[PDB]
Structures are given as C-alpha cells and as structure tokens.
Design an enzyme around this catalytic site. Structure first.
Site, PDB file in Angstrom:
ATOM      1  N   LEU A  51       0.814  -1.211   0.000  1.00  0.00           N
ATOM      2  CA  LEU A  51       0.000   0.000   0.000  1.00  0.00           C
ATOM      3  C   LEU A  51       0.850   1.264   0.000  1.00  0.00           C
ATOM      4  CD1 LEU A  51      -2.677  -1.145   2.607  1.00  0.00           C
ATOM      5  CD2 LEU A  51      -2.991  -0.929   0.131  1.00  0.00           C
ATOM      6  N   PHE A 106       9.943   4.338   8.530  1.00  0.00           N
ATOM      7  CA  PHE A 106       9.349   3.560   9.612  1.00  0.00           C
ATOM      8  C   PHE A 106       8.681   2.286   9.104  1.00  0.00           C
ATOM      9  CE2 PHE A 106       5.088   5.048   8.559  1.00  0.00           C
ATOM     10  CZ  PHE A 106       5.322   6.290   8.004  1.00  0.00           C
ATOM     11  N   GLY A 107       9.352   1.606   8.179  1.00  0.00           N
ATOM     12  CA  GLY A 107       8.863   0.349   7.641  1.00  0.00           C
ATOM     13  C   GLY A 107       7.883   0.529   6.498  1.00  0.00           C
ATOM     14  N   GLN A 108       7.310  -0.580   6.039  1.00  0.00           N
ATOM     15  CA  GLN A 108       6.347  -0.563   4.942  1.00  0.00           C
ATOM     16  C   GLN A 108       5.014  -1.171   5.366  1.00  0.00           C
ATOM     17  OE1 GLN A 108       6.826  -3.338   1.676  1.00  0.00           O
ATOM     18  NE2 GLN A 108       8.371  -4.501   2.816  1.00  0.00           N
ATOM     19  N   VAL A 109       3.978  -0.930   4.567  1.00  0.00           N
ATOM     20  CA  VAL A 109       2.643  -1.438   4.861  1.00  0.00           C
ATOM     21  C   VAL A 109       2.051  -2.170   3.660  1.00  0.00           C
ATOM     22  CG1 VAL A 109       0.261  -0.810   5.391  1.00  0.00           C
ATOM     23  CG2 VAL A 109       2.145   0.305   6.606  1.00  0.00           C
ATOM     24  N   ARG A 150      -2.506  13.561   5.186  1.00  0.00           N
ATOM     25  CA  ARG A 150      -1.768  12.391   4.732  1.00  0.00           C
ATOM     26  C   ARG A 150      -1.716  11.307   5.807  1.00  0.00           C
ATOM     27  NH1 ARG A 150       1.142   8.979   5.735  1.00  0.00           N
ATOM     28  NH2 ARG A 150       3.134   8.206   4.913  1.00  0.00           N
ATOM     29  N   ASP A 153       3.137  15.048  13.822  1.00  0.00           N
ATOM     30  CA  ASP A 153       3.043  15.207  12.373  1.00  0.00           C
ATOM     31  C   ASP A 153       1.678  15.252  11.701  1.00  0.00           C
ATOM     32  OD1 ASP A 153       3.805  15.759   9.795  1.00  0.00           O
ATOM     33  OD2 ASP A 153       4.606  13.755   9.392  1.00  0.00           O
ATOM     34  N   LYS A 164       1.819  -4.094   8.818  1.00  0.00           N
ATOM     35  CA  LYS A 164       3.019  -3.274   8.913  1.00  0.00           C
ATOM     36  C   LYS A 164       4.234  -4.152   9.195  1.00  0.00           C
ATOM     37  CE  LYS A 164       3.797   1.516  10.310  1.00  0.00           C
ATOM     38  NZ  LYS A 164       5.211   1.472   9.845  1.00  0.00           N
ATOM     39  N   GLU A 175       4.707   3.277   2.051  1.00  0.00           N
ATOM     40  CA  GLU A 175       5.992   3.152   2.727  1.00  0.00           C
ATOM     41  C   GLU A 175       6.193   4.206   3.809  1.00  0.00           C
ATOM     42  OE1 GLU A 175       8.365   1.444  -0.649  1.00  0.00           O
ATOM     43  OE2 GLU A 175       9.996   2.478   0.388  1.00  0.00           O
ATOM     44  N   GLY A 176       7.397   4.227   4.374  1.00  0.00           N
ATOM     45  CA  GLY A 176       7.762   5.196   5.388  1.00  0.00           C
ATOM     46  C   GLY A 176       9.259   5.438   5.407  1.00  0.00           C
TER      47      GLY A 176
HETATM   48  C1  IH7 Z   1      -7.534  -2.045   2.981  1.00  0.00           C
HETATM   49  O1  IH7 Z   1      -8.726  -1.640   3.668  1.00  0.00           O
HETATM   50  C2  IH7 Z   1      -7.205  -1.125   1.982  1.00  0.00           C
HETATM   51  N1  IH7 Z   1      -6.376  -0.104   2.248  1.00  0.00           N
HETATM   52  C3  IH7 Z   1      -6.055   0.784   1.292  1.00  0.00           C
HETATM   53  C4  IH7 Z   1      -5.284   1.867   1.301  1.00  0.00           C
HETATM   54  C5  IH7 Z   1      -4.599   2.304   2.355  1.00  0.00           C
HETATM   55  O2  IH7 Z   1      -3.958   3.354   2.286  1.00  0.00           O
HETATM   56  N2  IH7 Z   1      -4.697   1.490   3.425  1.00  0.00           N
HETATM   57  C6  IH7 Z   1      -4.039   1.685   4.573  1.00  0.00           C
HETATM   58  C7  IH7 Z   1      -2.779   2.294   4.631  1.00  0.00           C
HETATM   59  C8  IH7 Z   1      -2.121   2.445   5.848  1.00  0.00           C
HETATM   60  O3  IH7 Z   1      -0.895   3.050   5.996  1.00  0.00           O
HETATM   61  C9  IH7 Z   1      -0.184   3.468   4.797  1.00  0.00           C
HETATM   62  C10 IH7 Z   1       1.330   3.447   5.038  1.00  0.00           C
HETATM   63  C11 IH7 Z   1      -0.557   4.745   4.328  1.00  0.00           C
HETATM   64  C12 IH7 Z   1      -0.812   4.890   2.965  1.00  0.00           C
HETATM   65 CL1  IH7 Z   1      -0.677   3.535   1.912  1.00  0.00          CL
HETATM   66  C13 IH7 Z   1      -1.183   6.120   2.437  1.00  0.00           C
HETATM   67  N3  IH7 Z   1      -1.298   7.234   3.269  1.00  0.00           N
HETATM   68  C14 IH7 Z   1      -1.040   7.095   4.631  1.00  0.00           C
HETATM   69  C15 IH7 Z   1      -0.664   5.865   5.161  1.00  0.00           C
HETATM   70 CL2  IH7 Z   1      -0.357   5.787   6.860  1.00  0.00          CL
HETATM   71  C16 IH7 Z   1      -2.715   1.956   7.010  1.00  0.00           C
HETATM   72  C17 IH7 Z   1      -2.070   2.088   8.285  1.00  0.00           C
HETATM   73  N4  IH7 Z   1      -1.568   2.186   9.310  1.00  0.00           N
HETATM   74  C18 IH7 Z   1      -3.958   1.335   6.932  1.00  0.00           C
HETATM   75  N5  IH7 Z   1      -4.598   1.203   5.694  1.00  0.00           N
HETATM   76  C19 IH7 Z   1      -5.271   2.428   0.097  1.00  0.00           C
HETATM   77  N6  IH7 Z   1      -6.062   1.684  -0.676  1.00  0.00           N
HETATM   78  C20 IH7 Z   1      -6.377   1.917  -2.109  1.00  0.00           C
HETATM   79  C21 IH7 Z   1      -7.578   2.858  -2.240  1.00  0.00           C
HETATM   80  N7  IH7 Z   1      -8.294   2.673  -3.511  1.00  0.00           N
HETATM   81  C22 IH7 Z   1      -7.451   3.122  -4.628  1.00  0.00           C
HETATM   82  C23 IH7 Z   1      -8.203   2.992  -5.946  1.00  0.00           C
HETATM   83  O4  IH7 Z   1      -9.400   3.794  -5.901  1.00  0.00           O
HETATM   84  C24 IH7 Z   1     -10.261   3.360  -4.828  1.00  0.00           C
HETATM   85  C25 IH7 Z   1      -9.524   3.481  -3.499  1.00  0.00           C
HETATM   86  C26 IH7 Z   1      -6.545   0.678   0.055  1.00  0.00           C
HETATM   87  C27 IH7 Z   1      -7.368  -0.314  -0.263  1.00  0.00           C
HETATM   88  C28 IH7 Z   1      -7.723  -1.250   0.698  1.00  0.00           C
HETATM   89 BR1  IH7 Z   1      -8.895  -2.654   0.243  1.00  0.00          BR
END
Ligand code: IH7
Length: 294
Positions: free
Chosen positions: A21, A25-28, A158, A154, A50, A23-24
C-alpha cells in the site's frame, strides 16, 4: 526472537499478503486475515500489515517494536487506526492494523473534486456537512490521543485514513519522529513538505505540546476545505521561515465559510495558550455540524 504476547499474537499463516500500500518507519502491505474474530475462524477480513523493509537496520526494528508497544496501550477509539494483532514468533515482525479502503484523507479529497448528463451535473461527491464531519472526527480522535497523552508531532491529511464507511482514522500517532534532525527542505516520496505542518515552537524551539498538534490540525483543516490542497501552496521553504517569523498566515481558501477559516486562524495563533484545545475544537465543530438543518 521477540517475546510472546498471547493477547496480541496472531498466527502469520492465517495471513495472505496482497499488494503493498505504502511506505515510510517500515512498509505497509494490504492482506487478508482468517479468523481475526476468534468466533469465526474461517472468515476472511481485509487488514493492513506493517512490516520492516529489506533495509532492516536494528533500529528500524526497534522503532517498529516501539510503535507496536504504543499500539498495544493506546486503547480503542473509532477515530484512530486500531491494533488487530501482531506476528512475532518464528518469522518477520508483523504489526496488523485496521485497513482503510479509501486511502488517506488527502487522496480521498483530491479524487473527489467537482467536475454534463443528469440532473445533478454540478454536484460533486463532496458536500459541506461531510467536510465538517471529517474535521470533527479527526478532532475527537485527536482529543482521545491527547487524553492518553499521545502527541502526534506530524498531524496531516496524509496521516488521516478513510474507511469504507468514510470514518476518519488517525494513523502513525505513536512514532519516533526524528525531531532533532529534520531536514526542513526535504520533501517526501509523495512530494510532501512536513515542515509546513509544524508549529512555530516545534519548528523554532523544537518544543512539542498537544497545542502544537492543534496548529497542525489547523493546517489539516485548510487541506480539507481546499479538497486536498498542499498548504502554503507553491511557497518555497526558505520563504516559509521568514513568513512565519513575520506572523503571516495562509489566505482564506475559496468556498470556505468564515466560521471555518476562523477556526483555522485560531489554531494558528502564535502562543500555544491562545489556541483552542481539541475539546473546544470538537464542541465548535459540533455546533457547525448541528447547524446543518434536517
Ligand atoms: C484495505 O482496507 C485497503 N487499504 C487501502 C489503502 C490504504 O492506504 N490502506 C491503509 C494504509 C495504511 O498506511 C499506509 C502506510 C498509508 C498509505 Cl498507503 C497512504 N497514506 C497514509 C498511510 Cl499511513 C494503514 C495504516 N496504518 C492502513 N490502511 C489504500 N487503498 C487503495 C484505495 N483505492 C485506490 C483505488 O481507488 C479506490 C480506493 C486501500 C485499499 C484497501 Br482494500
């Protein structure tokens, strides 16, 4: 070889990793879990995992461990990203948290800016009472974190996540921030300049209080009612320094009622004591949310 925490330990084999999904403090990484609810062992659910990068310096591990321990003690609140479980035994460290299917608040808003077939051509996906609701939810989430003495350091759109049900969840609140080494000119992977969210006492004096999060909340407000705009838009960092020293603030964004620009300006008061508390922010936003008729 981390210690076992029975309350939070989840079998890693009950996880199926999907597409990464962010990145960062690790990846997700997005993943599907089975039996996250122990009452329904064969039931799938979409979670966010994470984990460490392939960098693995042992302080990257310690920081993720530190974040994990924070997640354990913060408690449950609907307006923050909550811990679901962890994987520590026999394999890489996983921190399993809630997944927000609509991404962060910034990406959510920018994708939903107004546009001619149909009766509502002019009508964008975003209405005023929904924007106020977003703000109000972040405020109450921040109100909770403040009560648990958890400074964000922070707070930005975002770092606010949006669920399938449009519930605001504050992410990355328990983090090592690198406060004493911040490259104020360094923009992130997605072009963000975190210095533009920093309170003066944090930027100039390296001092963080809950009121310094209030400053940031005001910047987050500006983002919301610009529908995902970047604060101090186009302004170089070198200018931001002298700009804030001269006590200047961002202008009032288009189609933003004076009620909310007023709140923004209140959060951006120089002295921390003359800024509203999140409790006062929650109440003030509630009154606005109340004023929407029917
Ligand atoms: C699962 O429900 C799901 N999640 C996402 C996300 C998404 O961002 N999920 C997410 C990210 C998290 O932390 C990351 C590092 C993050 C991101 Cl990727 C972006 N901005 C901030 C942060 Cl902190 C965390 C945590 N902790 C929890 N969840 C993004 N999508 C895609 C959205 N989709 C794109 C196409 O158009 C429709 C919307 C998803 C999807 C899903 Br299923």
């Amino acid at each position: 070889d981390l210690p076992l925490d029975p309350l939070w330990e989840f079998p890693r084999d009950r996880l199926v990793l999907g597409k990464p999904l962010g990145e960062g403090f690790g990846q997700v990484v997005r993943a599907e879990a089975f039996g996250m609810d122990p009452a329904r062992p064969d039931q799938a659910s979409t979670v966010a995992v994470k984990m460490l990068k392939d960098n693995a310096s042992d302080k990257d591990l310690a920081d993720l461990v530190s974040e994990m321990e924070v997640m354990k003690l913060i408690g449950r609140h609907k307006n923050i990203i909550n811990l679901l479980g962890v994987c520590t035994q026999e394999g890489p460290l996983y921190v399993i948290v809630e997944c927000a299917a609509k991404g962060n608040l910034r990406e959510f808003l920018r994708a939903r800016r107004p546009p001619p077939d149909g009766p509502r051509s002019s009508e964008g996906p975003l209405s005023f009472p929904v924007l106020v609701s977003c703000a109000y939810q972040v405020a109450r989430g921040m109100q909770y974190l403040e009560s648990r003495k958890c400074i964000h350091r922070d707070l930005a759109a975002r770092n606010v996540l949006v669920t399938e049900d449009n519930v605001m969840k504050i992410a990355d609140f328990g983090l090592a921030r690198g406060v004493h080494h911040i490259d104020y000119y360094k923009k992130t992977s997605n072009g963000r300049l975190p210095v533009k969210w920093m309170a003066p006492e944090a930027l100039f004096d390296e001092v963080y209080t809950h009121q310094s999060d209030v400053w940031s909340f005001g910047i987050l407000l500006w983002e919301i009612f610009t529908l995902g705009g970047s604060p101090y838009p186009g302004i170089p960092v070198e200018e931001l320094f002298s700009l804030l020293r001269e006590g200047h603030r961002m202008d009032r964004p288009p189609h933003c009622p004076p009620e909310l620009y007023g709140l923004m300006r209140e959060c951006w008061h120089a002295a921390p004591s003359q800024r509203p508390t999140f409790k006062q922010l929650v109440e003030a936003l509630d009154k606005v949310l109340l004023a929407v008729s029917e």
